[PDB]
């Protein structure tokens with residue numbers, strides 16, 4: 677680990693102030709999450725995160741349910757992280 681080929685999603689277009697806990701809380705509504713890494717980037721530029729679910733099926737559900745939803749004013753893009 678900590679990532680998994682089908683268990684990890686990549687989330688794009690997060691606001692720069694997003695915290696790991698905020699990501700955890702939002703994404704864990706789909707299923708339990710094992711880890712969250714947020715990419716280190718300049719403030720006021722879009723951020724990315726890798727979110728790894730405990731179960732592959734829940735990763736797929738997050739892609740379906742949470743892609744192009746609004747998170748802190750941003751439309752987030754959710755897909756396989758591979």
Ligand code: NA
Pocket residue numbers: 715716717
């Ligand atoms: Na980075």
